């Protein structure tokens, strides 16, 4: 599913990401925009042989099992395919574990490079939340 900006903002709000660990909703929408272009089916292979999955590009080395990443820790205890669903629940729940892990949203390279320090509330402007 390719979400609209406001549609995704609302879904993330309903799943409790607004101000989760202090990160306002626009941070999460911004990260999703630049990680996946709001596409739940997005996949991208990394140099180390792991793959990133879904709207928040969650990596198979640490967070989910894709059956082809040796030494995967699978900390979210889910198959990576679950992160590609039109229902964002699994991605949100796993993301809550990641952002609690120590480096906050810096775990998402696109967030650090393209969202951090910018006016992220622009991402939720105009939306009925
Ligand atoms: Cl933090
Ligand atoms: Ni990545």
From Swiss-Prot:
The active site is at 35, 52. Its EC number is 3.2.1.17. Keywords: Allergen, Antimicrobial, Bacteriolytic enzyme, Disulfide bond, Glycosidase, Hydrolase, Secreted, Signal. Disulfide bonds join 6-127, 30-115, 64-80, 76-94. It catalyses: Hydrolysis of (1->4)-beta-linkages between N-acetylmuramic acid and N-acetyl-D-glucosamine residues in a peptidoglycan and between N-acetyl-D-glucosamine residues in chitodextrins. GO terms for molecular function: beta-N-acetylglucosaminidase activity; identical protein binding; lysozyme activity. Its main location: secreted. One of its GO terms (cellular component) is cytoplasm. Lysozymes have primarily a bacteriolytic function; those in tissues and body fluids are associated with the monocyte-macrophage system and enhance the activity of immunoagents. Has bacteriolytic activity against M.luteus. Lysozyme C is capable of both hydrolysis and transglycosylation; it also shows a slight esterase activity. It acts rapidly on both peptide-substituted and unsubstituted peptidoglycan, and slowly on chitin oligosaccharides. Belongs to the glycosyl hydrolase 22 family. PANTHER family: LYSOZYME C. This is Lysozyme C.
